[PDB]
Design a protein around this ligand. Structure first.
Ligand SMILES: O=c1ccc2ncc(=O)n3c2n1C[C@H]3CN1CCC(NCc2cc3c(cn2)OCCC3)CC1
Ligand SMILES: [Mn+2]
Ligand code: NA
Lengths: 481, 190, 473, 189
DNA sequence: GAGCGTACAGCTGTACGCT
DNA sequence: GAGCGTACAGCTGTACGCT
């Protein structure tokens, strides 16, 4: 019939904008993932593509993810997966990929038909206890599948790997961090709810990029930690070595995060070709698999290498700023957060996961105890049980007779009818008793956790500590003060 | 690109703008080729509220629309030279389809405003729940969306020109703040 | 060092042979090229049957690409698309949802948008595949298993035809009418010394999905006798100043392209009398191309000669027989298929008998256990381990290892009243079934009749009217 | 188009690796010794210069890129002394489609750059297993590209007459002679 | 500045046989 | 002739926010 152009534009643009904000471009505060990444990692989990298992074809993964979880282009899915496997993009890679997954020179990965992928070992920690009712599941786009709303994420993934995302009306740009630092920070926070950002920074020095390099100063870091917004200068690792006859050369071995190496060299050569910079004689990318990143800039005899190097920082991506803008989803809404907020939201997420996991374990263990109690009754009075079943004309009658005679529940009665004859042998009765005895031990341990929040919080601590010891590594990015 | 219709009489003719060949195939098979033309675009079109004029005129997708409508642009625009009396926006029933619709309406508002004023610009209502229009069969797409007897087109009405000027400038304009403000003012999460 | 002649000959022979035996040519048994067989087997493994809902095309292609077909996604998808088009496949093998292309050469919607499942009749290609009827082979990487041939309970090669460009050779087989083919196979099964002329009483000629006309029986006969021949496919056109209406076009003719050539004719002043050329074709209306005449028979005859309104189908029946490319006539094609059916049904029976006998053996053990249950329990109860219990059951009751195993795996709920009557009833049915299967394995004629019956059932369920009219004169 | 040259300019020690695409090319660029090893990824099945007319051959993009990379020219205008590399390595996939691309490249080399073969600059690399587009940089370097460990097969022209006949028969426009060759030599087993 | 990274979308060569 | 149908291969245009 009729539709006002103003109403249409406002409605349609808000529809798109909100969707990009909440369901595309911005990561969750709890697991640090976007929809596409969480659907890739969940997809890997469902098809049992674990580190111990062999690589699977990338086309099969992207097809499974596209079909079940992500009703979007293959390009957007595949390219997302490739990033999580790149050791130059991801500080803690979440995907293990075999084949050509791209280089720092910005050549793309091989088409998905050549490559194979699987989980990394730390990705198991993202997904640990996902099947234990720790997180809520929601319908998928078509409603024929279920998908997680958030992963348990047993390590602080938002701050570890960081994120960048161009949304609508806003964006996010969060630098990666060191896992040993972050967990130490979370442990500190857990011991002091009224801890300062200042004190948190004793654990968390600043960003830690997979590409190492150098951070200039700590004032940039402090501001971004305090307000969620700040500018951190990333510098290449370059040295000047004398060459004899007064000659010098600049050797670059580490470049700023998210900088394309080939493109950076092109820029340098562009400045030399246009004579925008003075004193450079030769430019060679001697990067090899043996040496790693290596860029050699030869320098004329008369020219001062220090001046040339400083000029290269100003004029090229040799020095680059990372503009921190810490917008994550909190309770389904875009929020500019500070370092403490992000850690706090995560800790609360862990507490819930651990509390829900314990509740689930207690539910299952008590169910299993109920069953074992029924089996214990059955094996202790087996002669009576046999007779009761044999005198029964149908399975239904046997059900009722067992419940009446032995004061059994319906579930107990079913388990007895489902019992194999091999269970009547000597070893099995001791097996049921031993299983039931240690179960009672387990039930009380879980109750102790649910009885005291102090016990539960220590459990969170200890699990993070185990994840720190196993997956923690050295700082790569040197912060020069 | 254009799959034109047989009738060369603009008053009874309608053109459908679809997102591409995937939707274009369904549309071409389902259509009444006597009076229904089809122009498949190629994903997100240019935001004419942001782009420079030089880029707009050289834009291939923009050019194909101007050529299809046969009116021209701006001052050169002649409504009498329109070869279609119904320009129907038929984007996919998703959030990106809603975006492409805003981009198209932006072009129509800024370059071919008389089309909107004459009431030549319509919005199709495809059934919700389908991934794309290419996900639909031609028979179902024809009956529910394209057949004049059963379809439900929305005629785009410009009621307030000054309000519209501000609406387009805020949503589609170069300044992010105005957009972020609108989003904060209006966004419904729960 | 490496001789250039040696390298050229060996590297080219590798490609040529591969293309021939594993790309471009269909097997004579099931009429499938590798990519088609891999698509259909994928659908079956993932349980994408007609009763189940449509599955995302991208998810099928990724599954096929990952396990079976180490080739491009477009190669797989376009192949799957074609099996779902009622204008390409005389008996479509894929059931497609969304845009799957038209007669005008418009391709299908990107695979992110389409959904697919098996057709009813594809189930018949795969029927009995888990009954040791066909030989399985390692996939390309050795992580998966795939079939070398499908059981193909209907003659798919001739029904659906095939065109493939190989190396050194090619294939072009037209589709046929299912009823006619099965009738033809039934005839053959009764008369091995049957002639082509006799076979043509059942199989009148090709049957294109796009219907239309065939000019004469001469082209058909020569193609059926030698494996090669020209068959004239003519559009269905009627005359009604006057206008010509085309309702059916020849097979594999692009409708839009054909119209363009008619318009190109009149523009070049190559033909006389045409005033207007319109395509009024809609899905509801069907194919309708109208050619208006200046104030018509001579013009229509002229169009047949000068446009693809009449197109030749150059028949060239090359297929893989025993893993080798062979030019075959009609009889060879039916012989090779029937011999495949005879093997399929034989192997299925062997499997079935083997399965039934294994089961009837288990049931014997259960009967003894249920008949003497008081003793069974005590023997089990007095045992310390499962192994001891296994030995005790075998010794005391003269049971096999499998029988004793099945007794220990028996649930307590099977001690109930009706259970004993349920075991004996199943057992009596087995004994008769075992008997039926042995009769089939012991008499060639009984096996051959079983093939006849099963073929006839598919004919009665899926057989349809002929679409293409064969005009004599 | 997409050539990654070696830094050195001394052809006697330089080598160019011809690969099938960017999938293979990417891995190859990572793993190579960028001092002496160049990489030219083509865009798949290259034109058959035996069947194709000279107009099309000279118009072809991958053909043009190869001509430019070698710097020798074609025919009588061809000069051996102007070779940019003294090792032109055909590194085809592994698979049967690779073998085909191999025969298409040797057809081009024989017909347009025969003295390149004669001099012994043309080689065939042997990937270790399926395609080499699925290989890591370290894996590809050690197995195929490392002059310490690699096994390159030098193409040698023995009988010119016999080689002229081989190309005409296999790659020529007459199907029959090619069908015949297949019939005579194919062992299906 | 321009490109970061998830989104939308699609095209053109090449081989090979026949007719 | 040019296209039928399985194979090989890859690139460009759009949105969006930020420093
Ligand atoms: O449309 C065009 C136009 C030009 C062009 N140039 C270069 C180029 O690479 N491309 C160009 N294009 C397109 C694209 C080629 N395209 C072919 C399909 C392929 N699809 C990969 C894929 C998809 C899926 C798979 C596997 N592989 O299985 C799971 C589900 C879907 C991606 C690359
Ligand atoms: Mn769309
Ligand atoms: Na040297």
């Amino acid at each position: 019939n009729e539709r006002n152009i103003t109403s249409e534009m406002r409605e349609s643009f808000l529809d798109y904008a909100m969707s990009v904000i909440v369901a595309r471009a911005l990561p969750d505060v709890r697991d640090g993932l976007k929809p596409v990444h969480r659907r890739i990692l969940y997809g890997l989990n469902e098809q049992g593509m674990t580190p111990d298992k062999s690589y699977k074809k990338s086309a099969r993964i992207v097809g499974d993810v596209m079909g079940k979880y992500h009703p979007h282009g293959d390009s957007s899915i595949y390219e997302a997966m490739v990033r999580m496997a790149q050791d130059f993009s991801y500080r803690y890679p979440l995907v293990d990929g075999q084949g050509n997954f791209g280089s720092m020179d910005g050549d793309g990965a091989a088409a998905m038909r050549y490559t194979e992928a699987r989980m990394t070992k730390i990705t198991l920690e993202l997904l640990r206890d996902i099947n234990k009712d720790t997180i809520d599941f929601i319908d998928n786009y078509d409603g024929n599948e279920r998908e997680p709303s958030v992963l348990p994420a047993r390590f602080p993934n938002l701050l570890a790997n960081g994120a960048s995302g161009i949304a609508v009306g806003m964006a996010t740009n969060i630098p990666p961090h060191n896992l040993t630092e972050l967990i130490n920070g979370v442990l500190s926070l857990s011991k002091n709810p009224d801890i300062s950002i200042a004190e948190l920074m004793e654990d968390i020095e600043g960003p830690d990029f997979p590409t190492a390099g150098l951070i200039l100063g700590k004032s940039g870091i402090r501001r971004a930690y305090e307000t969620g917004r700040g500018s951190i200068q990333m510098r290449s690792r370059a040295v000047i070595e004398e060459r004899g006859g007064g000659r010098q050369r600049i050797v670059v071995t580490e470049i700023p995060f998210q900088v394309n190496k080939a493109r950076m060299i092109e820029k340098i050569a562009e400045l030399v070709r246009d004579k925008k910079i003075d004193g450079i004689t030769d430019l060679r990318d001697e990067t090899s698999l043996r040496t790693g990143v290596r860029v050699v800039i030869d320098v004329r005899k008369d020219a001062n290498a220090s001046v040339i190097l400083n000029n290269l920082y100003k004029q090229t991506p040799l020095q680059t700023s990372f503009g921190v803008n810490m917008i994550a989803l909190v309770n389904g809404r875009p929020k500019l957060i500070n370092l403490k907020e992000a850690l706090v939201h995560y800790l609360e997420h862990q507490k819930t996961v651990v509390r829900r996991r314990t509740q689930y374990n207690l539910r299952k263990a008590k169910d299993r105890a109920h069953i074992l109690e029924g089996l214990r009754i059955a094996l202790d009075h087996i002669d009576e049980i046999i007779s009761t079943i044999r005198e029964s004309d149908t399975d239904k009658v046997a059900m009722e007779s067992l419940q009446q005679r032995f004061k059994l529940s319906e579930k107990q009665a079913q388990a007895i009818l489902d019992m194999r004859l091999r269970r009547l042998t000597g070893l099995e009765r001791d097996k049921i008793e031993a299983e039931y005895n240690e179960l009672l031990n387990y039930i009380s341990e879980l109750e102790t956790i649910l009885a005291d929040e102090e016990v539960l919080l220590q459990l969170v601590r200890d699990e993070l500590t185990e994840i720190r010891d196993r997956f923690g590594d050295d700082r790569r990015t040197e912060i020069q003060l | 690109k254009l799959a034109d219709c047989s009738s060369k009489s603009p008053e009874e003719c309608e053109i459908f703008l679809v997102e591409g060949d995937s939707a274009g195939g369904s549309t071409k098979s389902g259509r009444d080729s006597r009076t229904q033309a089809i122009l498949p675009l190629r994903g997100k079109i240019l935001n004419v509220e942001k782009a420079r004029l030089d880029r707009i005129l050289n834009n291939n997708e923009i050019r194909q629309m101007i050529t299809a409508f046969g009116t021209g642009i701006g001052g050169d625009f002649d409504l009498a030279k329109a070869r279609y009396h119904k320009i129907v926006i038929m984007t996919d029933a998703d959030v990106d389809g809603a975006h492409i619709r805003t981009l198209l309406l932006t072009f129509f508002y800024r370059f071919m405003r008389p089309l909107i004023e004459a009431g030549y610009v319509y919005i199709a209502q495809p059934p919700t729940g389908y991934k794309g229009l290419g996900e639909m069969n031609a028979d179902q797409l024809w009956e529910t969306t394209m057949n004049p007897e059963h379809r439900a087109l929305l005629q785009v009405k410009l009621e307030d020109a000054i309000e519209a000027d501000q609406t387009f400038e805020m949503l589609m304009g170069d300044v992010v703040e105005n957009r972020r403000q609108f989003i904060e003012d209006n966004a419904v999460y729960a």
